[PDB]
Each structure stands twice: as C-alpha cells, then as structure tokens.
C-alpha cells in the first residue's frame, strides 16, 4: 500500500490484480479458519490491531485507484472493493458495524459488472458512487485528505510551469471529481468533530485562471466538474463562499468593481449556477434549502446592471435571465427568508430591461441580440410573476 500509494507503480495494472488475488485468498483462509474456529477476531477485530491498519491502507489505496488515470485499473478496485465487502461479511447483525457504507461498496460491483464504454463514463459512474458515499469512514478521510494532497502538489506544476502533459491533465481533472464528490464525508465528520473550506478556495480562484497552457479547456473542466460533479452536502458550503466572493465586487456606498476578472467570475458563476439549479442531484433538495440565493442574485443582478450594450453583455443578460427563470420554478426547493420583497425586487429591475434598443439599433445583429434578450426577459418576468403579490418598498 505504501508503494501503490507512493504512485511510482509503472506495472500497476498487474500489481492491483495480484493484489485482489491476495485478497481473494485472505479472504478464503479467514472463512476456513471461521468454520474450523468461529473465533482474526482478537488480532484484527477486537497501537492499535496491525490489521485495522492494514485494512485502512487497503481502503486507501483502493480509493486512490478509482482516480487512476488509467482504464482497467477501475474494475480492479471495484472487484477489490467487493472481495473487501466479501471478507467483512464474512467476519460477522449489521454489516455496517464495521464497514458504515457497504452499500456503496456493494454498489460498486454492479458498477464494475456492467460495461463501460470508455474512460470517461466511467469515470462518472465513479463521481456518481462517491456522491452516494453517505457516512464518512476513516478510509476516505484518509484517503481524501492525502488524494487532495497530491491534487494540490500536481495542481502547482502544471500552472507555475510556462503539450505531452495532456495526461496529467486529465489526470488532474478526474482528481478534481474525485473530490467534489467525496468531499462530503469530510464535511460531515467536520461538522460533528478546516481544509474542506480549503479546497473551494483554492476552486474559487480556479474559474479566473490564465495560464499560458490550455486555460480555456482547465476552465471548462473545472465549471464541468463543479456543477455536475458537486457533492449535495458541499451546497451550503459552496452558496456560503459564493456569496462572499460576488459581495467583494460592490464598494461601502454599492459602486460595482468593475473589472475584467470580476465580469469573467460572474459570467462563469451564471453558468456554474444554471448548472447546478438544472441537475436534478439525489437528495439535493434537502440541502440546497439551507442557504438562500438572496443576496448573491441581487449582486450578480446589480453588476449586470452596469454591463453595458456590447455582444458579451447581451449574452450575459440572456443567461442570467435563463438562471433566473431556471432558479424560480424551484421555489420549493429553495428557502426563503422574504420571498415577495425579493420577487418585487427583480421584477422591478428587469423591466427595465426588455425594450432596451428595440428601435435605436442600426444592425441585425444588435437587433437580433435585443429580441432574445427581450424575449428573456419576458420569460423570466413570467416565472417572477406567477402568484407575486405586490408590495412596494416603504414610499
């Protein structure tokens, strides 16, 4: 484990498939030992059992191989992580006694029965069991904390370094999934026992990143992996630092900062928020209505207040109001403190926007932006309106 996990196995294909034999016949032995003697039990199951800390480099390593940029390699973990299941029940009544998120593990073998068709689905069958790892075992704090480890030595090289890395670019994007979607056992045992909050700050500064190598593509990869790949449990957290860092673009009297960086986290904010409120998470409901979209969504509105009349502005408008649109037929699913006086807000600032420059346009282009923007407008003026009673402002 201290080699696997050491990442320098350039044979590592048949060292993990050696070592689920190993496994296999761990296994094996222990349920002959079982049936000649019950009760191993005292050396392993109750410094601490050498044993438990086996399993614990065991599991580990396992969750590192998921994140192996390689192919073959996932199934071999699945199956290992199966055979780990195997032996636990074997060794015992709950099966979570020992291992809490068997489930999951048990869900991995179906995983790894049926038949991926490339990396890249399967790497997202990956994302989407993490999402499923519910309680948070001493082998993924372990193994996220020193996972998150190397994702941030690898993070450096290829950002302060100014081609054959496309490898390790992929490398870098799975392990970024990784830890969206694992991320949440170490968010729920911090908040029963931080370097979680860590990790999205160092994702904050990841949307506005140029660098001479691929930033538009380390751009997209990373809006993809923090919208669909985001753990439900890291939502409050996520809203929370959003928040935040749009509140640090309004001076104390409210003058917006206006800055390319500042246009550039918005612009990706949008999408980054659209994608998220569009995806349908499991559970998501019961977390996104913790924290309120209030003030974010006013902010964003007030900075695309002053965006100006230029082609990127028209387009920002246009995904804002479709953020906004997407956000209000989720009324439920979010909480609000003060619903009407939010509502009564944006509806009064958006009327300002349809029929901006129906008419003082010279080109079709101009035109053509103005009518979708309009038409947005309209849409989200629709949604806002559905049951808005109105109550304006003190007079």
């Known amino acids: 484990c201290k080699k696997l996990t050491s990442h320098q196995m350039l044979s590592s294909t048949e060292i993990l498939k050696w070592l689920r034999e190993i496994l296999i016949c761990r296994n094996k032995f222990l349920l002959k030992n079982k049936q000649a003697d019950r009760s191993l039990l005292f050396y392993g199951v109750g410094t601490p059992p050498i044993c438990r800390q086996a399993q614990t480099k065991l599991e580990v390593a396992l969750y590192m191989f998921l994140w192996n940029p390689d192919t073959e390699a996932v199934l071999v973990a699945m199956s290992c992580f199966r055979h780990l299941c195997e032996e636990a029940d074997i060794r015992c009544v709950s099966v979570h006694n020992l291992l809490p998120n068997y489930n999951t593990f ?73 830890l969206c ?38 751009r997209t990869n990373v809006k993809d992996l923090v919208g669909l790949e985001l753990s439900p449990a890291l939502y409050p957290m996520l809203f929370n630092k959003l928040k935040n860092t749009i509140s640090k673009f309004f001076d104390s009297q409210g003058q917006v900062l206006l800055t390319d960086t500042n246009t550039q986290f918005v612009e990706q904010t949008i999408a980054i928020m659209k994608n998220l409120l569009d995806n349908h998470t499991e559970g998501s409901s019961e977390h996104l209505g913790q924290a309120s979209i209030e003030t974010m969504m006013l902010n964003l509105v007030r900075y695309v207040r002053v965006l100006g009349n230029m082609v990127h502005a028209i387009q920002i408008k246009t995904k804002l ?11 439920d699913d979010l909480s609000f403190c003060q619903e009407m006086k939010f509502r009564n807000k944006m509806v009064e600032y958006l009327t300002d926007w349809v029929m901006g420059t129906s008419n003082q346009a010279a080109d079709d282009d101009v035109k053509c932006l103005t009518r979708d923007l309009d038409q947005a407008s309209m849409e989200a003026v629709v949604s806002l309106l559905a049951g808005l009673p109105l109550q304006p402002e003190e007079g």
């Open 321 to 331: 109001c479709q953020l906004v649109e997407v956000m209000m037929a989720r009324r």
């Open 181 to 218: 979607a694992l991320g949440g056992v170490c968010l729920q045992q911090r908040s029963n026992s931080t370097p979680v909050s860590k990790f999205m700050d160092r994702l904050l500064s990841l949307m506005v990143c140029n660098h001479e190598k691929v930033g538009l593509q380390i």
């Open 106 to 178: 048990m869900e991995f073998a179906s995983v790894s029965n049926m038949m991926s068709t490339g990396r890249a689905a399967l790497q997202k069958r990956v994302m989407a069991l993490l999402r499923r790892i519910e309680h948070p075992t001493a082998g993924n704090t372990e193994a996220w904390e020193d996972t998150h480890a190397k994702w941030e030595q690898a993070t450096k090289l290829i950002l302060n370094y100014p081609l054959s890395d496309t490898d390790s670019l992929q490398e870098w994007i799975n392990m970024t999934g990784f």
